[PDB]
């Protein structure tokens, strides 16, 4: 029973960084894992990273460049994206997962250009 909103997108130089936020309103946020996905126009949606209370999982496409972190005092999950490449351009969207139930945000645009 949460609602999610993403922020932090933008248009950034190749090699640069962004930090996305997934902010939740509603009860018991700490009982949801939080997953980031990304999707470019014309393409399928792909998994990026996930965090539980503290353990994390990364797609091989972003390992070593992205870091997901969590602050339950702010009901927020962060995706720090370093060493960005043009191919990272996509809408990034977060997903709160509690057991088999899934809630989704809206998306924030990330565009990387040299």
């Amino acid at each position: 029973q949460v609602q999610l909103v993403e922020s932090g997108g933008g248009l950034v130089q190749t090699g640069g960084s962004l930090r996305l936020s997934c902010e939740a309103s509603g009860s018991a946020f700490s009982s949801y894992a939080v997953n980031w996905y990304r999707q470019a126009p014309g393409k399928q949606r792909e998994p990026v990273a996930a965090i539980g209370s503290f353990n994390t999982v990364y797609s091989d496409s972003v390992k070593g460049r992205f870091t997901i972190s969590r602050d339950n005092a702010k009901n927020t999950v962060y995706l720090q994206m370093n060493s960005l490449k043009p191919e990272d351009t996509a809408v990034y969207i977060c997903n709160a997962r509690r057991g088999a139930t899934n809630t989704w945000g809206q998306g924030t645009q990330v565009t990387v250009s040299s």
Binding site: A33, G52, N55, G99
Partner: peptide, 15 residues
Amino acid sequence: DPLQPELDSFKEELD
């Protein structure tokens, strides 16, 4: 991690 089952479900999506 108390949310490890959810993390396992996401790991299964990494094909």
